[PDB]
Design an enzyme around this catalytic site. Structure first.
Site, mmCIF file in Angstrom:
data_model
loop_
_atom_site.group_PDB
_atom_site.id
_atom_site.type_symbol
_atom_site.label_atom_id
_atom_site.label_comp_id
_atom_site.label_asym_id
_atom_site.label_seq_id
_atom_site.Cartn_x
_atom_site.Cartn_y
_atom_site.Cartn_z
ATOM 1 N N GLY A 90 0.794 -1.229 0.000
ATOM 2 C CA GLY A 90 0.000 0.000 0.000
ATOM 3 C C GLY A 90 0.825 1.276 0.000
ATOM 4 C CB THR A 91 -0.162 4.838 -0.619
ATOM 5 O OG1 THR A 91 -1.241 5.003 0.309
ATOM 6 C CG2 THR A 91 -0.722 4.515 -2.003
ATOM 7 C CB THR A 92 4.134 6.221 2.343
ATOM 8 O OG1 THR A 92 4.949 5.469 1.433
ATOM 9 C CG2 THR A 92 4.896 6.418 3.654
#
Ligand SMILES: [Cl-]
Ligand SMILES: [Mg+2]
Lengths: 250, 111, 244, 231, 229, 243, 240, 235, 241
Positions: F29-31
């Site tokens: 997933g994204t940060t």
């Protein structure tokens, strides 16, 4: 969530074997030896207190348990399974008998109730069988003294004397030579201590041996006086000192 | 003891012509000897060229109209935007009312 | 999820057999032999206890023969614990009927009820079947003396003479040879013990390895008596029939 | 492989294959386009027939006077999800006298789809949805995936060959967003967008399905000779 | 089915040209005992709505908590919670009216009479009533309990019909409301001198006035009254 | 083998492989990050712009619970929404019975027990998210991070997603260089920088920055989104640091 | 509760559990049904592997569902009891609510419906039973004979057989049964039914059961000697 | 094993796809819609000559204005028919009118995907639902176990479907009479059937606005078969 | 080989899932120790905060179950907190139903019974934790009772749990072999804590700062945990003799 295991985990194999019951019996075979001997005026049940650590207080772990004032139980196999069965056995003695008839159940019928619970864990959904064999000793007015074995399948048999667990085969042979129908309770205790010494490796004394009897009524353990018909429990657990006294006359 | 019903007064009148129909009603809402509102609409356009009034206990009246309006909406969804005929609306309202046969909508309904 | 661990106890094989029923029948074939013989003046139930010990308390022991009511008894072959579950249900059924109609339950009606319970475990629930076969010995005023058997499939049939458990093929052939319709109870007692003596896997047939019962109108006048034989009484009938 | 037997099982790389297989059903479905300006929002859908004797499967479903969607994938799953949206729009109107916000409708669809991806026995939904609507914050377009992921967009496309229409909308972004107060030109842009996804077949009178909602325009669906004007 | 224990009396209200006014005293009665003297019965919801409640106080505190939870819930996943998608008076009323009718239909009512006063997004005045029976109605003036019998007649002299609303200023409306509260203090045995008043204006927003007192009372004429005949 | 095919099964190591596979979805997933400041907390997240057709500032990721708690997560977004929905039910029932808004440590355990419950049975799948959350209560500011196993601890700073290693290193510098503490306004600036720096692991597509905060002095202990001028100021500060 | 889908489709579009239930029917003892001009006869095979049986009390193969309808079967005996009980309950329920006994077709339709239900319900397996249902509708003299099977499909038959070696006896019936002129009397119908079983049975002793059903609730089971006389006459004509 | 509601890698439900294979093994059913009515015809396919063929019921009335023909595992159709009849009658009770043919079809198709671990498997039967209503006139629908239904001018299902559908492709036009449709169903049934077509192994039916749903007598169909034979010998 | 996935018997009469749950117990790499004084019961546990971004005040494996009962856990924190919440609920319910405080040994038995059920019922997995309950019981005095994933429990004079339990166990065994009594003969709990820390230092062969340890103390009518500064005072006293 929800218990979605509504199917049997114990089933017949092509050869007609119920695998999980056989494997439960194997667990019992690995368990510490326990025995029972019936005399004319009593019954004795005994086992070794195999302490897991010397820092552990083995007096806080009870292998021999009172079920009713006149009925006691010992086991071989999985300790935790035994503990919960003792809880269920104590309760069913009240719910399915004492709350109905106003008296404690006879030995054979309490055994029958415990047996039913163990049978159901062999057929009901999403459970395994109990990994214990029980020896239940007791007395009641109309049947006298009795001793029963209950296995993981739920099957039960009455015995004059027997042994279960680790060294049961050798112990049963030892009991066959010594048992007769004229034994007094003290003779049965003596034979019990002799039989149990063979299967014990290390220390053999009152602190490493657990022993209880079903014998005479104990009015000193009743806790009250005034009712003539109430004469006290027949179940009594022998003390560490009482065991050691009989180990000198061994 | 709690009385779940009330009486909000009001009078309504429906007349059917040869190629038209009227549904009239007064706009006064009351309890006992007090006036709640001098203008509280009681006759409603329910869609599909149907007008409706449920007179008596206003809480039940509003609930029934609200449920019937909803029934018209779902009739369209379920039956390819078919127009709900007046006879079909009448039968539908019977079922809305009899659904509470043992705890009735305390109203007299006219469409 | 849980499906992974499901054995599916209630399915047909490609041949149209019920796996678990067939395997339960295999289990029962290793149980001690039980025999029932019906005569004109009564019924005999004889059964072999499985390899016993000298320290087993026989006089208080029961693994084969059970009383369902005063008119009906059963012989068990298979898992004893499973049998006791069904036996208790049958005892309740008999009492339910007696309360409802104020008459003792006819034998077949009791047999059909227990057999239907067995059937259910083969069709629904996903549980293992009961590993038990019964021989029912009973009396009622419609059909008189009756013998039935039921097995884990829930199928039941009526018999003049029948065996369940171990060596049924050998036992049934011996019964078929010596059984006659005008036979009496005392003759049937002898036939049952002789058949067990020949089919047994033990070296010799003794009193401590047997359970025995009769249902007789040998009860004073127009009534029926059940007799569960005591260890000494089994010892006597073994001497009388000339087996020991 | 060993981890695609049910929706309750992650793969060793953290993938959910049953959800990915449900996503694949959308790719097999017929193309549908969604786009909006600041005043209107438009759905365009290419309907698919079984053969020449058969009808063309309907693609657009009305949810309320101010909201509706188009589908691509398993049609019965769209019926279930659109029914749920109809109920939720309806609950909002009956209880709160409030038209359901398009963004909140997306949140509700996400949560309903999610429950079918974390439990045993069930299965993911096998359909993708494009939801358009006009509420108190203007025109809106949403894209729903049965993974649960809902996204608000100016324009998009789903179904087979949807990549062609999506690239066209990405080029035309600055033009079609400015088409305010002109419904016909916004539909033209949508019909031109869906044309970038056609091969062998062209837009006919029983092939094309168009829907529109806007400032003073209830959600209405156009089929048959009503779309001949745009062919 | 129950009975009200601790109760609040009249809530009165009216529309004027640019908004609405609502008022209610600060008393919590226990039968004839004037038990609690600091009870706020006007409950603001945002900056555009004020809910005025009479009847059972325990049920009022419950409704107060429902409204507080409504604001929390509306802000969830709502970037426009303080703008286009903020709670309207009409949303708050319909919610309460749904709850009240459902509760009477289970034969377990919230023993209250409620008036929701506010200004909508488009500037329109909102004023509607709902009670323990789920009965609803709207009018240029609304009042509960004793206020229905004594306040409405006075407030209806200012705004007798819809066309009188644009002709009515906020000064004239507040004056009429304040006079009615004095009349209720003269004549309602379960009323108090202390009250709260709230104005919701489409231009100046929500003005909430606490610790108001009934003043300019006439009692001097009592000295001349002697006997009963 | 086969121990990894079913949830809640212990491997011979004593590991739950299904939970470890859920972590892989989180790492994909994204940060997203969290910074604990002097009188509150700041949350920030990387939003990948997959296409020009995405409406800017519309697809909001950070979620509020009650009025004083913020939640952000990386991994399967629907799973995170499901967890926040439960969290909102937990917070509502707490406030219903006890009146006071749920304390942050109390709220942390409610989420923890619920996530842990999804590792007890094979009939459910573990959560495919790591959640960073926190806020202000009566005892001050609190920042937590919760994993698929149900494991959670309190943090001075937290990071998860694809660029978590980069983010962690940046957070560790702030802890060392500011033992006395960081202001809320400083934390917003620093949060912007860290997301921009962490975007190197996702450098293919461009992104949108989203920040929120709860502070005793700046937001009266309520959760608010950073908008307009304050957001632009943080973007400018971030862009200046990467160049 | 146990919900497992045991009856499911396979890649080739077969439901194996239903097909395996038919294999159980193939194993069961042979049953045959023949309708004459004014009667229906149900014949049943009794396997002589079981002697020492008590024939008074042993469950008979033909069962009365009502005074005017009978049911025979091939397959699992225990399974058949559940269908017979349900059918009997429904027969009385029909009399109670409609105030008329069931038609043979209605009773067949009900039993067939139960069988179908057990092919797409969770946690259950199909019945390993096929049935022959015969009788006369109330106040009607037209003979009725129906067949059901595990899948739940049912149909009417001029003559039919089920169970083991039913392929052989169906072969016999197909060449010996004339539709234009069915067995005009009880004698002719019983004779043709016994003849059909003699193709398969073995000894004509206690292996053949015969039940005759006539109009107006006239149902009787033939005894050993009565059947033995048919067996005798058939072979004496055959010696030629 | 594997879930009953499992998707394949291609995005299709295994069980639904497998039930479609069972329908391919079923006896042929054909429907043709005209402006004068809709015709429904089926192959009876008796397994033996001793089976009384008039007890084979593969064409069924749902209401006066709606008929239905089936192909596949026909036992599975009984609960579907029961639901359809109940839905048709219930709507008349609630709304004092006939239900639309599409709405009836949609109600039947809602049952289709209600399976899992509700019923344990999908239906193994396909239905041709034919009828008339005032809004959309004469209609013919094809209801599948996938839950999908297509409207058709003409449609064939069962074992001889693709050969029959190709034939229907050529023969159907918008001006067909009812008589022409009857002969056309008979012609195509005769083409795909194993056994020789007669009045005992095939069955006709129709739905008209005036007379409603009617199953044809064997005597009536026998005449139409004789009329078919003569017109094919006419060139 | 599905007998290894769920809690059914293997052909040797073993429960592999239970055995593997015992292995999960050491996943945290933390050692704990418990001893009894005259008037008190002390429990110490290693504290490791490997990340600088962590708030060290929230990292804990000691739990205050009731006013009188404390619990230290060996195993992963999710299962630890699961057991903690349940124990707290059970203790509170007990007091409500039976009118007196739940004894330490009774709570241990109850949690042991719950664990037994997970070894018999297939749908529930064992918790990968070992629970050491401590108190000064009003009847039995200073008490240590420890539960494991098999559903086994027993009382202890002293006990140790963790990867290096054997080293600590033997060290404790040797001390009680000398003293020939079942407890630490000391008046104050402060000195009993000093004994506990000293013998853990000796057994593990490692020195401890104030942040490396975690301490719980049970006295009559209360269980409490020490702060870092309270532990520091303990460490100073150890070093000064
Ligand atoms: Cl317990
Ligand atoms: Mg388990």
């Amino acid at each position: 969530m929800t218990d979605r295991y509504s199917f049997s985990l114990t089933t017949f194999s092509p050869s007609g074997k119920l695998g999980q019951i056989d494997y439960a019996l194997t667990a019992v075979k690995q368990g510490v030896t326990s025995l029972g001997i019936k005399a004319t005026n009593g019954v004795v049940i005994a086992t070794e207190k195999k302490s897991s650590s010397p820092l552990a207080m083995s007096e806080t772990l009870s292998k021999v348990s009172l079920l009713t004032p006149d009925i006691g139980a010992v086991y071989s196999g999985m300790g935790p399974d035994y503990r919960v069965l003792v809880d269920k056995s104590r309760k069913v003695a009240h719910t399915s008998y004492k709350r109905i008839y106003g008296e404690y159940p006879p030995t054979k019928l309490l055994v029958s109730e415990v047996a039913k619970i163990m049978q159901e864990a062999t057929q009901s959904g999403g459970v395994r069988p109990f990994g214990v064999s029980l020896l239940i000793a007791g007395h009641d007015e109309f049947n006298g003294f009795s001793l029963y074995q209950v296995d993981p399948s739920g099957s039960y048999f009455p015995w004059k004397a027997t042994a279960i667990g680790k060294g049961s085969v050798a112990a049963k042979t030892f009991l066959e030579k010594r048992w007769n129908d004229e034994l007094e309770l003290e003779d049965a205790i003596h034979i019990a201590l002799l039989t149990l010494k063979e299967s014990v490796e290390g220390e053999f004394n009152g602190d490493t041996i657990e022993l209880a009897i079903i014998g005479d009524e104990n009015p000193d353990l009743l806790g009250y006086t005034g009712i003539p018909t109430d004469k006290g429990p027949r179940f009594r657990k022998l003390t560490s000192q009482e065991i050691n006294d009989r180990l000198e006359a061994l | 003891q709690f009385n779940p019903y009330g009486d909000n007064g009001g009078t309504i009148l429906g007349i059917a012509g040869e190629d038209f129909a009227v549904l009239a009603g007064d706009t006064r809402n009351i309890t006992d000897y007090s006036i709640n509102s001098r203008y509280e609409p009681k006759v409603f356009d329910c869609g599909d060229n149907i007008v409706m009034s449920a007179n008596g206990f206003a809480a039940d009246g509003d609930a029934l109209v609200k449920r019937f309006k909803n029934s018209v909406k779902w009739y369209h969804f379920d039956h390819n935007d078919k127009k709900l005929s007046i006879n079909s609306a009448a039968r539908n309202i019977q079922h809305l009312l009899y659904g509470k046969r043992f705890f009735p909508y305390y109203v007299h309904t006219i469409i | 999820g849980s499906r992974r661990y499901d054995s599916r106890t209630t399915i047909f094989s490609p041949e149209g057999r019920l796996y678990q029923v067939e395997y339960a029948l295999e289990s029962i074939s290793h149980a001690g032999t039980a025999i029932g013989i019906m005569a004109s003046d009564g019924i005999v139930l004889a059964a072999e206890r499985k390899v016993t010990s000298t320290l087993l308390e026989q006089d208080t022991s029961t693994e084969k023969l059970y009383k369902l009511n005063d008119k009906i008894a059963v012989a068990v072959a298979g898992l004893t614990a499973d049998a006791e579950i069904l036996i208790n249900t049958a005892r309740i059924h008999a009492q339910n009927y007696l309360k409802t109609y104020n008459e003792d339950i006819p034998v077949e009606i009791l047999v059909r009820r227990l057999s239907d319970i067995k059937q259910g475990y083969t069709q629904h629930g996903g549980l293992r079947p009961f590993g038990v076969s019964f021989i029912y010995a009973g009396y009622d005023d419609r059909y008189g003396y009756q013998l039935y058997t039921s097995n884990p499939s829930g199928n039941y049939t009526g018999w003049k003479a029948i065996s369940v458990g171990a060596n049924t093929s050998a036992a049934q052939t011996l019964l078929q040879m010596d059984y006659k319709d005008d036979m009496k109870v005392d003759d049937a007692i002898e036939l049952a013990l002789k058949t067990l003596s020949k089919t047994t896997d033990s070296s010799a047939l003794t009193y401590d390895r047997l359970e025995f019962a009769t249902i007789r109108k040998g009860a004073n006048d127009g009534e029926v008596y059940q007799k569960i034989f005591k260890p000494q009484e089994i010892k006597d009938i073994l001497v009388k029939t000339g087996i020991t | 492989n060993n981890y695609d037997g049910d929706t309750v099982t992650f793969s060793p790389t953290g993938r959910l294959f049953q959800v990915e297989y449900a996503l694949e059903a959308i790719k097999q479905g017929s193309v549908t386009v969604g786009l909006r300006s600041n005043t209107h929002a438009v759905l365009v859908a290419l309907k698919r027939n079984a053969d020449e004797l058969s009808s063309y499967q309907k693609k657009i479903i009305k949810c309320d006077e101010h909201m509706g969607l188009s589908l691509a994938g398993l049609a019965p799953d769209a019926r279930v999800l659109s029914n749920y949206l109809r109920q939720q729009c309806n609950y909002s109107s009956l209880v709160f006298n409030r038209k359901l916000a398009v963004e909140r409708a997306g949140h509700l669809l996400c949560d309903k789809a999610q429950k079918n991806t974390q439990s045993y026995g069930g299965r993911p939904y096998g359909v993708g949805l494009l939801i358009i609507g006009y509420d108190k914050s203007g025109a809106h377009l949403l894209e729903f995936q049965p993974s649960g992921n809902v996204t608000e967009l100016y324009g998009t496309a789903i179904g087979a060959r949807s990549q062609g229409a999506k690239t066209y909308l990405e080029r035309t972004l600055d033009t079609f967003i400015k088409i305010d107060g002109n419904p016909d030109e916004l539909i033209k842009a949508g019909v031109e967008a869906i044309s970038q996804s056609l091969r062998d077949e062209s837009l006919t009178v029983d092939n094309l399905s168009i829907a529109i909602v806007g400032k003073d325009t209830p959600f209405t669906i156009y089929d048959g000779e009503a779309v001949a004007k745009y062919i | 089915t129950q009975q009200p224990i601790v109760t609040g009396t009249s809530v009165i209200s009216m529309k004027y040209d640019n908004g609405v006014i609502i008022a209610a005293d600060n008393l919590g009665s226990y039968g004839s005992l004037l038990r609690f003297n600091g009870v706020e019965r006007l409950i603001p919801v945002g900056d555009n709505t004020v809910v005025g409640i009479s009847g059972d106080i325990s049920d009022m505190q419950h409704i107060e908590r429902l409204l507080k939870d409504l604001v929390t819930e509306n802000a969830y996943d709502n970037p426009l919670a303080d703008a286009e998608e903020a709670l309207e008076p009409s949303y708050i009323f319909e919610y309460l009216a749904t709850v009240m009718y459902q509760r009477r239909s289970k034969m377990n009512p919230l023993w209250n009479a409620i008036i929701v006063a506010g200004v909508q997004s488009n500037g329109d005045q909102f004023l509607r009533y709902v009670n323990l029976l789920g009965v609803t109605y709207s009018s240029p003036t609304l009042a509960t309990g004793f206020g229905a019998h004594m306040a409405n007649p006075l407030l209806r002299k200012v705004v007798d019909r819809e066309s009188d609303i644009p002709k009515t200023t906020v000064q004239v409306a507040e004056e009429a409301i304040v006079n009615a509260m004095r009349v209720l203090y003269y004549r309602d045995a379960r009323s108090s001198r202390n009250f709260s008043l709230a104005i919701i204006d489409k231009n100046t927003g929500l003005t909430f006035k606490k610790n108001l007192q009934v003043e300019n009372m006439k009692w001097d004429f009592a000295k001349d009254i002697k006997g009963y005949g | 083998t086969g121990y990894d095919l079913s949830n809640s099964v212990f491997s011979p190591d004593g590991r739950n492989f299904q939970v470890e596979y859920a972590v892989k979805a989180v790492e994909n997933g994204t940060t997203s990050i969290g910074i604990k400041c002097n009188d509150g907390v700041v949350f920030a997240v990387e939003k990948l712009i997959t296409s020009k057709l995405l409406v800017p500032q519309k697809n909001v990721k950070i979620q509020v619970v009650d009025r004083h708690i913020g939640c952000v997560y990386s991994g399967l977004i629907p799973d995170g929404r499901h967890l926040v929905n439960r969290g909102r039910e937990e917070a509502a029932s707490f406030k219903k019975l006890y009146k006071t808004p749920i304390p942050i440590p109390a709220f942390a355990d409610r989420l923890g027990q619920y996530v842990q419950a999804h590792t007890l049975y094979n009939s459910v799948r573990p959560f495919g998210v790591s959640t960073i959350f926190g806020g202000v209560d009566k005892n001050g500011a609190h920042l937590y991070m919760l994993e698929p196993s149900g494991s959670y601890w309190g943090y001075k700073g937290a990071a998860t997603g694809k660029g978590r290693q980069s983010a962690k290193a940046e957070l560790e510098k702030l802890v060392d260089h500011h033992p006395e503490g960081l202001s809320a306004r400083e934390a917003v600036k620093q949060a912007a920088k860290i997301i921009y720096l962490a975007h190197e692991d996702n450098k293919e597509k461009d992104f949108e920055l989203e920040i929120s905060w709860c502070s005793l002095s700046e937001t009266n202990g309520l959760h608010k989104f950073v908008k307009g001028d304050l957001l632009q100021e943080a973007i400018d500060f971030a862009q200046k640091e990467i160049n | 509760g146990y919900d497992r889908a045991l009856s499911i489709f396979s890649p080739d579009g077969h439901i194996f559990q239903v097909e395996y239930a038919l294999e159980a029917v193939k194993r069961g003892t042979c049953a045959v049904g023949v309708k004459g001009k004014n009667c229906v006869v149900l014949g049943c095979e009794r396997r002589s592997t079981l002697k020492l049986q008590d024939t008074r009390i042993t469950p008979s193969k033909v069962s009365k569902i009502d005074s005017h309808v009978v049911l025979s079967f091939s397959g699992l005996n225990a399974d058949s009891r559940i269908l017979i009980e349900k059918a009997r309950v429904e027969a009385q329920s029909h009399r109670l609510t409609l105030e008329d006994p069931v038609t043979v077709e209605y009773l067949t339709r009900y039993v067939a419906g139960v069988q179908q239900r057990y092919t797409q319900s969770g946690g259950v397996r199909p019945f390993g039973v096929s049935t022959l249902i015969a009788g006369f509708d109330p106040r009607d003299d037209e003979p009725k004979l129906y067949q059901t099977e595990p899948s739940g499909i049912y149909s009417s038959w001029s003559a039919q057989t089920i169970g083991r070696n039913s392929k052989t006896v169906r072969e016999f019936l197909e060449k010996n049964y004339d539709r234009k002129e069915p067995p005009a009397t009880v004698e002719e119908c019983v004779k043709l039914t016994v003849r059909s079983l003699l193709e398969v049975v073995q000894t004509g002793a206690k292996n053949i059961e015969i039940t005759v059903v006539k109009p107006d609730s006239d149902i009787v089971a033939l005894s050993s000697e009565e059947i033995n006389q048919y067996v005798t006459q058939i072979e004496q004509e055959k010696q030629e | 094993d594997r879930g009953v509601s499992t998707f394949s890698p291609e995005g299709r439900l295994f069980q639904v796809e497998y039930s479609l294979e069972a329908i391919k093994l079923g006896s042929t059913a054909i429907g043709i819609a005209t402006k004068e009515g809709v015709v429904l015809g089926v192959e009876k396919r008796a397994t033996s000559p001793l089976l009384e063929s008039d007890s084979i019921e593969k064409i069924v009335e749902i209401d006066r204005h709606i008929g239905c023909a089936m192909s596949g595992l026909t036992a599975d159709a009984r609960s579907m028919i029961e639901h359809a009849r109940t839905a048709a009658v219930t709507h008349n009770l609630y709304y004092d009118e006939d239900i639309n043919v599409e709405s009836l079809t949609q109600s039947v198709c809602d049952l289709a995907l209600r399976f899992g671990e509700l019923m344990s498997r999908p239906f193994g039967v396909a239905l041709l639902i034919a009828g008339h209503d005032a809004d959309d006139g004469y209609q013919l629908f094809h209801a599948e176990p996938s839950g999908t239904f297509y409207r058709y001018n003409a449609k064939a299902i069962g074992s001889g479907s693709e050969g029959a559908q190709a034939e229907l492709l050529n023969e159907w036009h918008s001006s067909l009479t009812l008589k022409e449709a009857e002969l056309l169903v008979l012609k195509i049934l005769k083409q795909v059937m194993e056994e020789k077509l007669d009045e005992n192994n095939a069955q006709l039916s129709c739905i008209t606005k005036q007379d409603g749903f009617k199953i044809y007598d064997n005597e009536k169909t026998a005449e139409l078969i004789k009329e078919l034979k003569e017109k094919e010998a006419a060139e | 080989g599905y007998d290894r996935h769920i809690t059914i018997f293997s052909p040797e009469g073993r429960l592999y899932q239970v055995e593997y749950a015992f292995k999960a117990t050491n996943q945290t790499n933390i050692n704990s120790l418990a001893v009894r004084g005259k008037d008190c019961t002390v429990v110490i546990s290693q504290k490791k905060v490997p990340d600088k971004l962590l708030d060290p005040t929230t990292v804990s494996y000691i739990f205050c179950i009731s006013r009188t009962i404390g619990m230290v856990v060996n195993g992963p924190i999710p299962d630890a907190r699961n057991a903690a919440l349940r124990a707290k609920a059970e203790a509170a319910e007990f007091r409500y139903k039976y009118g007196y405080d739940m004894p330490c040994d009774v709570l241990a038995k109850r949690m042991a019974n719950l664990s037994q059920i997970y070894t018999q019922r297939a749908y529930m997995r064992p918790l990968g934790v070992i629970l050491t309950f401590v108190s000064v019981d009003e009847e039995l005095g200073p008490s240590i009772y420890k539960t494991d994933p098999a559903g086994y429990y027993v009382g202890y004079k002293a006990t140790a749990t963790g990867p290096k339990q054997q080293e600590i166990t033997t060290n404790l065994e040797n001390h009680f072999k000398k003293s020939k009594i079942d407890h630490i003969n000391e008046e104050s709990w402060e000195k009993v804590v000093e004994f506990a820390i000293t013998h853990m230092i000796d057994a593990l062969g490692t020195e401890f700062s104030k942040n490396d340890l975690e301490v719980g103390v049970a006295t009559k009518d209360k269980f409490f945990t020490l702060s870092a500064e309270n532990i520091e005072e303990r460490l100073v006293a150890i070093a000064e003799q």
